[PDB]
Structures are given as structure tokens and as C-alpha cells.
Amino acid sequence: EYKVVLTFGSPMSPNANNKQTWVNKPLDAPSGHYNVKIAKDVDHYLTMQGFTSIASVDWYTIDFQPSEAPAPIKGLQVLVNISKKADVYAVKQFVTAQTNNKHQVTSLFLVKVTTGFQVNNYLSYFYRASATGDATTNLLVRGDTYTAGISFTQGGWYLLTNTSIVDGAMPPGWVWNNVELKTNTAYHMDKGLVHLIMPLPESTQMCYEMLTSI
Amino acid sequence: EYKVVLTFGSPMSPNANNKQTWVNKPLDAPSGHYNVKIAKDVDHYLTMQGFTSIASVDWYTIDFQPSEAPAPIKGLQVLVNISKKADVYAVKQFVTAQTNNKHQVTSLFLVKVTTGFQVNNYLSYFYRASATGDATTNLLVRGDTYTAGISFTQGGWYLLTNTSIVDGAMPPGWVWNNVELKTNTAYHMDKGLVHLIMPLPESTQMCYEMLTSI
């Protein structure tokens, strides 16, 4: 286990400092294109939603003493179609009980790209309508998608996310349920989503406690 | 200067895990009530907007070595009307250039309450409308306010925020411009706002580099 300090880079196109954060929404992609998947094997993988460039990474022990970067996690891969494009160095899940029967799971993967690539994906964003009075108004994902290209550069660090909503029974450890972003379903905030409302300014630092194994 | 790790408590009423974060919006308060102000003197103060309970604080040097908590910052006060309700232990501003002529300044104050108190304030929340296509849709503050009570407990740590939008010329160091949350004006995200969309789960940790002087 490590304490990991990420220094955020500039937003990845089509994102911008003054725009809503676009994330991949579905479990499919346009014709001729592919999702980015973070996979343990063919039956256990999560589809990339959030994509964020990380300028640098500082590694520490769990009590904050300085450490050299670990080696890649064996047996995890960032895949496009059937080819591995990045190594995974650290992982973390945030599990939130919205209710006992509705859990939100946000998975974060710190990855380093080994073959540069681009994908066209169906993108959307979080939004929240104004409402009158003290009524609850939900954090939602826009239904419509905007098809756009996303580019990943060799040698770059990236932070990838996936958020699932799991109904009913939960498994006991790492959750592999792969669920597209829902529209019409309330999300909560968790520490894995704080960078996905609008891009945080380049040079912003965030600290996470992360694992180097599933 | 310190690296400060905050462990978030439960949301403060009227907030909840499943609700938008309510923040104080204006520079005034209902009849018979008062804003919370974080003041250096009568001509230099910021009005509380965000209010968040912090369960615990861990203090480190700038390179992450463990440290005892500092003493309160002399000459800063958390005031209600004309009475000091809390000591300020650490401060930080995030300054964002939306454009060269529109800067966003988010100030964070880590405080410990010394006399418990309650205020009724005019509250609002951040929202973002759905829009079609790849149009930018702004992060805004709802115009309408909801009047509600906010309670602060003796001995508790709290994180207070203020965000200003400054038009034109900027001062060179700590910005004392006190500006209510605007409606109809785009906000960006900064590291001081990441906990103010919806409450982060109790026990979430966030790390900040903070000062113990202005």
C-alpha cells in the first residue's frame, strides 16, 4: 500500500479549464472504434469513463515516508480492442452505500501509457438541475452523448476511472461489476469523482491511499 | 507551512450524503441573524460560504514528516456579529485565472470552535444545466436561497470556505475581496471546491498544503 500524490496536468481534449468534464459514458463505442478497458482477465474488467492526464507522481509509504515507484501490477492491463496500451501501477476503489441496496463503486487506476493511442468514444458529463425550495436535486449524467476523440501519449501518466451502481447484493472485496454511467439515476460524490466535475487547475495536487494489487 | 490531512466528518445539517451541498450564498443574513466572518480586521474579512465538519487533522512538514499541531494564528478570528467563535489554525487560497480579467479565489480556513453557536443563513448550491451538443454548460449557483440553521459545536474542527470572483486588476498576495456567490456567472472547479458539490463520505481524507500566517 502507498500514499500517492498526483500532480494534475492540463485537461485532455476535448476537455478544457472552462468546460464541464467529458467522460466516456457507455459500454460500447462508435463503429470502427473501441472502449478503453482495464482488465484482470476476459471476465473481469471495467470500462474507462474518466480520463485525466497526470503530470507527476510522488510515492510514499502509508505513514508518508518517501519511496521509489513500484513496478507495474502484474496481471492488470489497459486494453484497446485486444492490445495492451498501458501498465497499471496503483488502484483504489471507493464503495459508497447510497442505500443498503444501492452501492456506488468508483475505481481509480493510475496507469502509464506504453503505446500511444487514440479512441473515439461517446462522451457525456455530470449535471444537476436547479430546483425550487429545499427539494433534493440529483447529480445525474446527461443522456445525450457527444462523440469525440481522446488521445493518450506514450510515457504519460493517466488517472482512469469507472463508476458502477450495483443493485442488491454486494461481493466482499474488489467489485468487478461493469456498469455504464446511468442517466436518470442519482450519483453521490466520492473521492474518486472530485476531479470529474470540471478539470482541476494544472499543478493541483491530490493525495490517495492506493494498492498495488487487487 | 504544513501538509495537512483532513478526515471528513458527517455532513452538517441541513446537508446529507444524498443531497446537494448547501452553502451560505450572500453577504447578509435573515433578520436577527448573522453571517459567519473570517476576519483579520474590520476592513479585511471574508464571509463564510462552505461549512464542513472535520473529524480529525493530521499535521506534517512540507515534505510529509509528522508534526504536532501549531498554535492558533494570532490576529485571525471567526466572528459572529462582534464575538469570536473559533480560532483559525491554517489557511490557503487557490487563485484561478478564468481569464486575465476574471479571477476566482477560493479561501480555505481550518478552524476549531471555542464557543458553540448556531446561525440562520440564506443557503444555495452549485448546479449545472443539461445542454445539447458539445456546448459549454456553466457551473452556476442557484439564485433562490433556502433559509436554514447551521450549528457549530465547541471543540470541533471545521473547514470554512469563501469563493470570490474578482474582475480586473488583482492584488499581489492574499486576496481580501469579499464577494457573494454569484448567480448567472460561471465558476470553475478548484481544490477548495471539491468537497462542496455533494458531501464526501465520512472518513474521506484530503491533503492540503496550508499556511499558518497570511
- Cα–Cα distance list, A205 to A195, A202, B207 (Å): 11, 9, 8
Candidates A6, A20, A125: best to mutate against B (most CBs of B within 10 A) is A20
Closest residue by Cα to residue A94 from A201, A190, A208: A190
Residue of A nearest to B7 (CA): A191
User: Which residues in B lie closer than 8 A to residue A181 (C-beta atoms)?
Assistant: none
Determine whether the interchain pair A201/B94 forms a contact, defined as Cβ–Cβ distance below 8 Å.
Answer: yes
User: Which residues in A lie closer than 8 A to residue B23 (C-beta atoms)?
Assistant: none
Q: Which residues in chain A are immediately followed by a break of C to N over 2.5 Å?
A: none
| Distance (Å) from the alpha carbon of A52 to chain B's nearest alpha carbon | 15
- Cα–Cα distance list, B135 to A15, A183, A206, B167 (Å): 12, 19, 29, 24
Residue of B nearest to A206 (CA): B207
Of B96, B197, B204, the CB nearest to A197: B197
Determine whether the interchain pair A134/B14 forms a contact, defined as Cβ–Cβ distance below 8 Å.
Answer: yes
Resolution (A): 0.9
Q: Which residue has the cell 436547479?
A: A130
- Cα–Cα distance list, A55 to A7, A85, A110, B144 (Å): 6, 18, 12, 40
Candidates B93, B132, B183, B197: best to mutate against A (most CBs of A within 10 A) is B197
Query: What contacts 24+ positions apart, CB below 8 Å, involve B97-104?
Result: B98/A17, B98/A18, B98/B186, B98/B188, B101/B167, B101/B168, B102/B165, B102/B166, B102/B167, B103/B165, B103/B166, B103/B170, B103/B175, B104/B163, B104/B164, B104/B165, B104/B166, B104/B187, B104/B188, B104/B190
Determine whether the interchain pair B132/A144 forms a contact, defined as Cβ–Cβ distance below 8 Å.
Answer: yes
Return all residues near A154 (Cβ < 8 A) that are at least 6 apart. A113, A114, A115, A116
- Cα–Cα distance list, A143 to A22, A49, A185, B21, B132 (Å): 13, 14, 11, 23, 10
| Distance (Å) from the alpha carbon of A97 to chain B's nearest alpha carbon | 10
SS3 B146: strand
- Cα–Cα distance list, A14 to A79, A160, A197, B169 (Å): 21, 16, 14, 30
Are the C-beta atoms of A128 and B20 separated by less than 8 Å? yes
Are the C-beta atoms of A6 and A159 separated by less than 8 Å? yes
User: What residue segments make up the domains of chain A, in order of their start?
Assistant: 1-214
Helix (H) or strand (E) holding A149: strand A146-152
Determine whether the interchain pair A128/B126 forms a contact, defined as Cβ–Cβ distance below 8 Å.
Answer: yes
Cβ-count burial B144-178 (b if 16+ within 10 Å, e if not):
ebbebebebeeebbbbbbbbbbbeeeeeeeebbeb
- Experimental method of this PDB entry: X-ray
Determine whether the interchain pair A207/B209 forms a contact, defined as Cβ–Cβ distance below 8 Å.
Answer: no
| Distance (Å) from the alpha carbon of B158 to chain A's nearest alpha carbon | 19
Candidates A122, A198, A203: best to mutate against B (most CBs of B within 10 A) is A198
User: Which residues in B lie closer than 8 A to residue A204 (C-beta atoms)?
Assistant: 190-191
User: Which residues in B lie closer than 8 A to residue A19 (C-beta atoms)?
Assistant: 136
| Pairs of CB atoms within 8 A across A/B | 124
- Cα–Cα distance list, B158 to A100, B3, B7, B10, B70 (Å): 29, 17, 11, 11, 16
Determine whether the interchain pair B142/A130 forms a contact, defined as Cβ–Cβ distance below 8 Å.
Answer: yes
User: Which residues in A lie closer than 8 A to residue B93 (C-beta atoms)?
Assistant: none
Question: CB atoms < 10 A from the CB of A196, how many?
Answer: 25
| Distance (Å) from the alpha carbon of A84 to chain B's nearest alpha carbon | 30
